[PDB]
Design a protein around this ligand. Structure first.
Ligand SMILES: C[C@@]1(COCc2c(F)cccc2F)CC(c2ccccc2F)=NO1
Ligand SMILES: C[C@@]1(COCc2c(F)cccc2F)CC(c2ccccc2F)=NO1
Lengths: 260, 260
């Protein structure tokens, strides 16, 4: 991949792998989310962020701050097949004191058609206490020079009430689910949300839209319950909570289209 | 990737991704095993096997036969870092009536040095009954023309006895663990074997050698126990068994080197 001529966005092509596809031999949404993360990381490196950790500015490092995902919204029009080339363009924009947005557009590299879109809200937090911080002028000024400054857009979740229609309990991360800092990878939470979708829905529908809020992390030694209720196309409300009716981890919604 | 000039092996380069690395920012062994699978699948397509299923010959399809892994042996000298290019060369050889071998050699694409080696024994089995079959002349003759015929080599596991020194119980696959035919991906079994290795070993050692036998599949709805005992460098004996002291799934051994 590479920066675009103006230096304010990044493009990368990916060839969909054998193990990245599901039963229709198209990329899973977890594969798409992994590719979104990878092109974001390669963008960060291309504009001078670290080649051996996740992106931080100089002032973030001084203050022990990291970027963490607060919300992810993905819409897929067509999932790419095994062996297809998908090209993803990504960019960031300042969200003032709130945080930082990363947007993505997915294209079929052969047709040039848009096959999906995504946006994410990232917030600052202290890596040790996990307490949120507003973006200071020093941190914003460090990264603003890598962002378009005029708007460039790729485009409330309620709490599931007991009893859940569907559940998958006792979900636990294995080492493959952990990132280079031994934190649960953000894509693992997408997989866990979808685990409580009945298999018959997955067999007969394609996921068109997912919206996920990220409230708290699952630690390596935590156990998660995935809860789903039908709200309808098929639409669902989702809640991930720590085992034992503990803290909410994630809430979300999905929209599914019947297979052709 | 592409076939080599003589058409009898296949090479592919991979750039190690952000989510493919562990805490030392080098590829996990599960990442390496996924890359071995992907280059094998791309080799199969390059010599005229299907672009929308795992490799079968014409006679295999007529008889409802598939290739399944019986044994995997991987040795890694150096795990590639995040953003490094690893080049993998792969080839197959007939094993007479027993099955078919796939071998791999991993190289650091910048230095050209060998960083790892792998070999696998694949057997025929009926996809419906899971009963093994010897390779018939018709099937061997269909694939022999894609193999070196003179030897080209990249280079008994006992049953763990109760009580196991270490365990991880209740492991269950999620949809990301399933392949395009809704079978548990072979790399998932490597992850499950390693889950019962204590975290302190993983934190202080690198895996140098893994040998894994594959006896039976975990179904989507099965639950697996991972059992490990120290036999020693650190060496371990491994057993994966279905929950409830059910059927053995896998047995294996690993050898670990202290981190520099
Ligand atoms: C918010 C975040 C910022 O990344 C650094 C960065 C800029 F700040 C401005 C322009 C380009 C750029 F790269 C963090 C982030 C991220 C973090 C970890 C993993 C994956 C990611 F995409 N992706 O976007
Ligand atoms: C045994 C197996 C054979 O693949 C077909 C094939 C030949 F038979 C001969 C030369 C090249 C070639 F490709 C099956 C296999 C495999 C199967 C599923 C997934 C991944 C794999 F590597 N990899 O190797």
């Amino acid at each position: 991949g590479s920066l675009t001529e103006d230096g304010l966005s990044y493009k990368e092509k990916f060839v969909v792998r054998s193990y990245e596809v599901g039963s229709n031999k198209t990329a899973t949404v977890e594969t798409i989310a992994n590719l979104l993360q990878e092109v974001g990381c390669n963008h960060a490196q291309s504009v001078g962020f670290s080649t051996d950790g996740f992106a931080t500015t100089t002032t973030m490092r001084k203050l022990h701050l990291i970027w963490v995902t607060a919300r992810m919204h993905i819409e897929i029009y067509k999932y790419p097949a095994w062996g297809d080339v998908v090209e993803i363009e990504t960019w960031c924009q300042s969200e003032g004191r709130i945080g930082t947005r990363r947007d993505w557009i997915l294209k079929d590299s052969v047709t040039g058609e848009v096959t999906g879109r995504a946006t994410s809200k990232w917030v600052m937090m202290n890596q040790d206490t996990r307490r949120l911080q507003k973006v200071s002028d020093d941190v914003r000024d460090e990264y603003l020079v890598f962002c378009p400054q005029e708007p460039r857009l790729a485009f409330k979740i309620p709490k599931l009430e007991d009893p859940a229609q569907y559940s998958m309990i006792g979900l636990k991360p294995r080492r493959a689910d952990l990132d280079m800092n031994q934190h649960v990878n953000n894509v693992t939470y997408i997989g866990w949300v979808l685990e409580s979708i009945p298999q018959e829905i997955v067999d007969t529908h394609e996921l068109q839209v997912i919206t996920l809020d990220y409230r708290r992390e699952c630690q390596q030694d935590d156990v998660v319950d995935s809860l789903t209720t039908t709200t309808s196309d098929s639409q669902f409300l989702h809640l991930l909570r720590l085992s034992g009716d503990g803290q909410e981890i994630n809430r979300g919604t999905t929209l599914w289209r019947k297979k052709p």
